Amino acid sequence: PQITLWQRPLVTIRIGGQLKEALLDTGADDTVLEEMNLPGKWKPKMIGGIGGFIKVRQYDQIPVEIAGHKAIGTVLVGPTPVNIIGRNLLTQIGATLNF
Amino acid sequence: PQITLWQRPLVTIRIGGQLKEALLDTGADDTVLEEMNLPGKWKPKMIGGIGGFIKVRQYDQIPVEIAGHKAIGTVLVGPTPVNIIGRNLLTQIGATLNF
């Protein structure tokens, strides 16, 4: 790609056979996917921004596919209104912003 | 500019003889500034984040120079973690997500 900002940057990801939609967030520190039953160990954590903080569970080394590009990283599950692909993984598929 | 994601995409914004550090957040619909006085009649708005909704005070048509590229538009002032340049001003200046 080269995604356009006219419309939000929604894309599609693979997570454990979950084909899903995500917002490429150059403004997200982390990756927060809504409610999903990942396999494993986690540790609560807190994140916030406009609004305040909300609690999410953090999973280590989880494999993911951002539009035919593998990447594996930390992924937070929790009460988000949009699965969001933060920079952590963003940095693994070669995303840049250009103007 | 080709800006990588290994660090937050923070660039200097020139907003009417005022300079600030803002964040190129492609997950943001709008441009939200930390409390500030702008010339103009505002109207109160409520926008949302991961934490919930915040009441903001909005200014229409306002020029901003995003690292020496000019945008002219809505700019909301409020209680944010930081300055975010959203897809409102972000597409005026022609930013794209490449990967």
């Binding site: 994140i47 916030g48 921004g49 209104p81 | 926008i47």
Partner: peptide, 7 residues
Amino acid sequence: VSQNXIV
């Protein structure tokens, strides 16, 4: 009805 994204 406008949303804005994480620290």
